[PDB]
Design a binder for this molecule. Structure first.
Ligand SMILES: CN1CCC[C@H]1CCn1cc(C2=C(c3c[nH]c4ccccc34)C(=O)NC2=O)c2ccccc21
Ligand SMILES: *SCCCC(=O)N1CCN(c2cccc(Cl)c2)CC1
Length: 277
């Protein structure tokens, strides 16, 4: 079969724009199927030496086949642009819901954290480090299950510094992320869901980094006791001592944390998600 062409689609609303691309809701006309198409401007990426970001993106997404990840279905191109055909997540970003609801109750925090843990287990088992995990790239599909995206910045085990709020100490100081770096980000995300704000906050990127490296943060008075404990076991400076990391014997003991007491891990992706708080 021939590669798809722009003419095969009716391009609809722009979902969002990044520094090097536009993600656009599009309908494949022949089958009426909706896709999020990521449109990349070749010149801009050429001129900014970002191409590796582009192949890693295509490569990593092509090997993702798990319910909690965005999938890459096709790729085509013209002179101007590169087009990635992606899963469309109708309900947008986890971030949107944090803003809208303010903070999640325990039921919701527990459910979504569990889906994120399950997704990271899959990813890490494939030797992939996300390196930029944040509510902005944890999407929600029509059934309100999560779909993680944004893989151009991932590391595959075969100079980058992710978003300041969620970046790990080892990436800052050692210039090297590891699987465990994503568990640090998970800690930050759990904290954000419960508190409504991320744990390392300050007036600029430099000051946020300083807090990260010194592990300087506080828990508000609203914080669920079991979530407090879990976060403290994720936000640990030493990457080999985080609950869930390989050196701490993996995902077993993480999933056994009592914060997850009432969760059924088996077919999480088939369970009905709790209505957002
Ligand atoms: C900050 N950004 C620049 C452009 C996208 C956005 C980051 C979050 N994000 C969302 C993405 C996706 C989708 C989006 C759903 N609602 C959105 C609103 C703005 C931007 C993207 C989306 C999607 O349906 N499938 C996706 O893969 C996506 C796909 C690749 C890389 C990053 C992505
Ligand atoms: S759609 C199939 C994409 C194949 C691929 O991996 N490519 C194609 C050429 N590429 C490229 C050309 C010009 C500018 C940029 Cl940023 C990328 C990417 C590699």
């Amino acid at each position: 079969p021939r590669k798809k062409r722009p003419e095969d689609f009716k391009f609809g609303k722009i979902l969002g724009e990044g520094s090097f691309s536009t993600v656009v809701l599009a309908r494949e006309l022949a089958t009426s199927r909706e896709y999020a198409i990521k449109i990349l401007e070749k010149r801009h990426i050429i001129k900014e030496n970002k191409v590796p970001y582009v192949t890693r993106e295509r490569d990593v997404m092509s090997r993702l086949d798990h319910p909690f990840f965005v999938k890459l279905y096709f790729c085509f191109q013209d002179d101007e642009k590169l087009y990635f055909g992606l899963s469309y997540a109708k309900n947008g970003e986890l971030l949107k819901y944090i803003r809208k609801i303010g903070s999640f109750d325990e039921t919701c925090t527990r459910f979504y954290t569990a889906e994120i843990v399950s997704a990271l287990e899959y990813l890490h088992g494939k030797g992939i480090i996300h390196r930029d995990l944040k509510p902005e790239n944890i999407l929600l599909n029509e059934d309100m299950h999560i779909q993680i995206t944004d893989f151009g910045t991932a590391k595959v085990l075969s100079s980058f510094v992710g978003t300041a709020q969620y970046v790990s100490p080892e990436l800052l100081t050692e210039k090297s992320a590891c699987k465990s770096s994503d568990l640090w980000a998970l800690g930050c995300i759990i904290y954000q869901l419960v508190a409504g704000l991320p744990p390392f906050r300050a007036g600029n990127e430099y000051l946020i980094f300083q807090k990260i490296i010194k592990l300087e943060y506080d828990f508000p008075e609203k914080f669920f006791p079991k979530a407090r404990d879990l976060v403290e076991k994720l936000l640990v400076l030493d990457a080999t001592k985080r609950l869930g990391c390989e050196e701490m014997e993996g995902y077993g003991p993480l999933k056994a944390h009592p914060f997850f007491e009432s969760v059924t891990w088996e077919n999480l992706h088939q369970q009905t998600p709790p209505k957002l708080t």
